[PDB]
Amino acid sequence: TRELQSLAAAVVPSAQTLKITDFSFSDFELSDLETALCTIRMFTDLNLVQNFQMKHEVLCRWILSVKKNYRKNVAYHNWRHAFNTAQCMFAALKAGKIQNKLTDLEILALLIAALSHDLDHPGVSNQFLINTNSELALMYNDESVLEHHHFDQCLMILNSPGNQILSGLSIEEYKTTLKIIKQAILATDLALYIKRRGEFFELIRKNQFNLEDPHEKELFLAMLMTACDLSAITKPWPIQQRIAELVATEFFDQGDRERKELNIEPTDLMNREKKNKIPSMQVGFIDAICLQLYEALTHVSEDCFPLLDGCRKNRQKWQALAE
Numbered sequence: 001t002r003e004l005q006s007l008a009a010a011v012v013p014s015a016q017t018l019k020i021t022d023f024s025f026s027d028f029e030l031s032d033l034e035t036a037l038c039t040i041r042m043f044t045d046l047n048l049v050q051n052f053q054m055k056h057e058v059l060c061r062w063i064l065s066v067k068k069n070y071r072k073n074v075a076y077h078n079w080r081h082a083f084n085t086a087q088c089m090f091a092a093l094k095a096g097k098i099q100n101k102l103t104d105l106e107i108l109a110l111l112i113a114a115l116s117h118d119l120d121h122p123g124v125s126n127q128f129l130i131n132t133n134s135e136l137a138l139m140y141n142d143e144s145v146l147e148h149h150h151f152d153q154c155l156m157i158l159n160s161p162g163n164q165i166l167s168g169l170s171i172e173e174y175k176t177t178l179k180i181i182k183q184a185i186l187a188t189d190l191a192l193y194i195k196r197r198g199e200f201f202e203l204i205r206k207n208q209f210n211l212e213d214p215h216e217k218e219l220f221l222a223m224l225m226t227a228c229d230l231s232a233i234t235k236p237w238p239i240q241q242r243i244a245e246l247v248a249t250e251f252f253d254q255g256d257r258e259r260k261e262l263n264i265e266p267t268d269l270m271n272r273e274k275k276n277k278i279p280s281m282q283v284g285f286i287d288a289i290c291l292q293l294y295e296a297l298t299h300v301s302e303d304c305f306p307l308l309d310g311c312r313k314n315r316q317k318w319q320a321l322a323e
């Protein structure tokens with residue numbers, strides 16, 4: 001309470017005013033309340049609120065519950081990263097012109113998934129959970145451990161009294177939507193991105209890519225989730241640099257845990273003593289993970305180009321530091 005009364009009583013500013021259609025968006029200057037207002041605006045301007053009969057108070061409560069169930073002191077995987085992922089999703093749908101390629105249920109599921117995809121993230125990786133004998137890893141057979149947990153949390157909030165933003169869906173629409181949400185959240189496991197992207201890139205290369213094919217549509221949604229999840233890498237340099245510091249802080253904190261709990265020397269990525277490797281690793285990551293993805297997305301919709309453009313600009317800046 002208190003936070004809900006403040007949020008529910010507010011007039012929600014326009015998308016124009018909130019700057020949320022911009023791929024270059026920064027959350028840094030916004031209060032928590034302002035991010036929640038932006039989130040309501042995203043639901044509203046994607047025609048989800050009236051379409052699916054969402055009650056204002058219920059949507060507000062759900063947003064606040066999602067926000068609360070991030071761990072505030074985890075450096076990167078906290079509410080601001082989920083919010084930014086959702087904002088990139090909104091921008092890709094609007095400015096990037098992806099909206100008209102998708103169904104209403106797909107849009108509904110994508111926005112929910114974007115906001116929910118790292119719920120209760122502990123600030124350590126899947127491999128760390130496996131290595132420290134996490135019950136979650138045992139439960140989920142070492143496969144996309146965190147992402148199954150994020151999905152479980154997503155479900156828990158969606159079912160929580162007063163938070164049921166999907167309660168207005170018909171039985172069939174609800175079934176369809178939950179399935180898309182599950183696949184969307186699981187897709188944010190970078191291991192699954194690496195596993196499946198080859199198929200996506202090949203379909204595009206061979207002029208075989210067809211969004212009307214249900215399997216290819218699912219594949220595309222998975223790739224779009226990754227593109228949004230990684231979108232800090234596309235931001236104007238000062239924004240990207242600030243977020244890269246958070247990513248490093250989280251990784252180095254894991255490395256500290258690995259030294260203590262596993263008695264191992266962390267890999268460079270997670271080793272604060274070797275923070276000098278950051279620029280070269282950023283370049284390597286952009287090349288190995290990011291560029292092909294943003295290239296593929298731009299092929300699907302040319303209006304997604306600014307994501308690719310921003311990624312290329314950051315590559316240049318990191319490479320200048322590395323060399």
Ligand SMILES: COc1ncc(-n2nc(C)c3cc(C(=O)NS(C)(=O)=O)ccc32)cc1Cl
Pocket residue numbers: 190229230231232233240241243244247269281282284285
């Ligand atoms: C500023 O935005 C970002 N900055 C860094 C990452 N990020 N995420 C992961 C996982 C990751 C792994 C590497 C790496 O080098 N991995 S490696 C070859 O195994 O050493 C490097 C950067 C990474 C993601 C974003 Cl969105």
Ligand SMILES: [Zn+2]
Pocket residue numbers: 117118146188189
């Ligand atoms: Zn994740």
Ligand SMILES: [Zn+2]
Pocket residue numbers: 081085117118188229
């Ligand atoms: Zn994420």
